[PDB]
Amino acid sequence: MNWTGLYTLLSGVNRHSTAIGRVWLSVIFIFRIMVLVVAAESVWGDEKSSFICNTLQPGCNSVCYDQFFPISHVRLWSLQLILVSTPALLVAMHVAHQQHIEKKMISGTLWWTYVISVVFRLLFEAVFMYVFYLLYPGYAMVRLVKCDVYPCPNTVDCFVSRPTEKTVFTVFMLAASGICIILNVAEVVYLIIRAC
């Protein structure tokens, strides 16, 4: 777990990444993973089991939970991290492949593919930010929700588990994601400026 080994691993052995991309982006990425790990099973572990509705209708609990939580926040963030990390993984594999072929026997190609990688990383961050806004308007969760989907008769009151703690972690993850967007834009601008 040598510091130089961890730095080499996270940097992806890329010769075009700048200081922000090799230090700040990696740290924020680690921060999001650690927050997600400590908050996934602990806070969102009983999201559905503890979800109850004030009714005697069989199946109203499950249908109301599905109505109000089409996809859990933890899974949404997990997908966001995987999708955001994919272009970095592709660049790392491409660099390793180039090292392999040159050992068996370019700089502009590496520069261009890195820039495209950062652009796609920024694009994925923006898309997931918009999707999160679309599914869950606002940032705070409420204790009581009004559910009227079939088979629930009329409108029933359903209660969410730990809405305040989930709100706190939602703010943390959203703030970290916003910082990643800002750093990615700065990285793109810095690369373009240095290219001239």
Ligand X SMILES: CC(C)CCC[C@@H](C)[C@H]1CC[C@H]2[C@@H]3CC=C4C[C@@H](O)CC[C@]4(C)[C@H]3CC[C@]12C
Interface residues toward a second copy, by CB under 8 A: 54-57, 146, 153-157
Q: Is 130 left (phi over 0), alpha (psi -120 to 50) or beta?
A: alpha
Residue nearer to ligand X on the CB measure, 69 or 124? 124
Residue 57 binds which entry of ligand X, a second copy, none, CB below 5-8 Å type-dependent: a second copy
Residue 151 binds which entry of ligand X, a second copy, none, CB below 5-8 Å type-dependent: none
State the Cα–Cα distance between residues 25 and 27, nearest whole angstrom.
Answer: 5
Of 25-33, 58-66, 71-79, 103-111, which part binds ligand X (CB under 6 A)? 25-33
State the Cα–Cα distance between residues 43 and 170, nearest whole angstrom.
Answer: 11
Is 36:29 a contact under the CB 8 Å cutoff? no
Binding mask 48-87 for ligand X (x = CB under 6 A): -------------------------------------x--
Question: Exactly one of 39, 88, 152, 183 binds ligand X (CB under 6 A); which one?
Answer: 88
Residue nearer to ligand X on the CB measure, 10 or 52? 10
Least Cα distance to 114 among 29, 26, 11 occurs for 11
The end-to-end CA distance of the chain, in Å, is 38
Is 33:84 a contact under the CB 8 Å cutoff? no
Residue 157 binds which entry of ligand X, a second copy, none, CB below 5-8 Å type-dependent: a second copy
What are the tokens at 67? Answer: 């109505």
Of 22-30, 44-52, 147-155, 170-178, which part binds ligand X (CB under 6 A)? 22-30
Residue nearer to ligand X on the CB measure, 15 or 143? 15
Residue with tokens 């989907």: 149
Q: What is the DSSP letter of 136?
A: S
Cross-strand bridge partners of residue 147: 156
Residue nearer to ligand X on the CB measure, 64 or 118? 118
Task: Return residues touching ligand X (CB under 6 A).
Answer: 9-10, 25-26, 29, 85, 88-89
